[PDB]
Write a protein that binds this ligand. Structure first.
Ligand SMILES: NC(=O)c1ccc(CN[C@H]2CNC[C@@H]2N(Cc2ccc(C(F)(F)F)cc2)S(=O)(=O)c2ccc(C(N)=O)cc2)cc1
Ligand SMILES: [Cl-]
Ligand SMILES: [Cl-]
Ligand SMILES: [Cl-]
Lengths: 99, 99
């Protein structure tokens, strides 16, 4: 589809068997999801921006379904104010910016 | 143009007569530029980032070029990790997400 930016570009995603609302975020290098269980090993990481930094757990090789498009990649889990789909997964579904 | 997301969508902007690098950030509601001199009065604005909320300065009706596309609108000034072109101006220049 084509998504305009009058409002936040929120979509429904499926991750770890849960449905969640997430923001298509071209400014995010990686995907960041609110606290949840994910299977596998993880390593701690810090990410930040305006307001400072948060600590997240980095899980690799996680499958997420985004608007019917399956993509696999790294997911950071931690206290993000909003669920974020970052570039690492946006590329996999063929998402571009156009103007 | 059509911009893919394998790398950060960094573009050249022109503001206050000077060229700067900025990030096309669909996850940002607003446009936030690093400390510089802008004309006119400013108003207070609280924005929520990944790490918390902070106060920045809001200037309205500011002339700005983004990837050569002329725009006029609201620009916030504050301690941002990189210059950010957010949804307010992305919308104005006709930028959509597509997949
Ligand atoms: N390192 C990572 O992978 C990472 C880092 C941060 C995030 C959170 N998402 C980013 C992108 N959109 C806004 C958000 N932020 C932009 C941003 C942009 C770039 C970077 C950096 F280059 F450092 F990696 C960090 C943060 S933000 O928090 O500074 C922000 C929030 C709101 C607004 C606004 N209202 O205009 C402006 C800026 C997600 C992932
Ligand atoms: Cl990845
Ligand atoms: Cl591609
Ligand atoms: Cl505006």
């Amino acid at each position: 589809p084509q998504i305009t930016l009058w409002k936040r570009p929120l979509v429904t995603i499926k991750i770890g068997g849960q449905l969640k609302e997430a923001l298509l975020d071209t400014g995010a290098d990686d995907t960041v999801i609110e606290e949840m269980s994910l299977p596998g090993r993880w390593k701690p990481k810090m990410i930040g921006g305006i307001g400072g930094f948060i600590k997240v757990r980095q899980y690799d090789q996680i499958i997420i379904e985004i608007c019917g498009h399956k993509a696999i990649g790294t997911v950071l889990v931690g206290p993000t104010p909003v669920n974020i789909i970052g570039r690492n997964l946006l590329t996999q579904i063929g998402c571009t910016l156009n103007f």
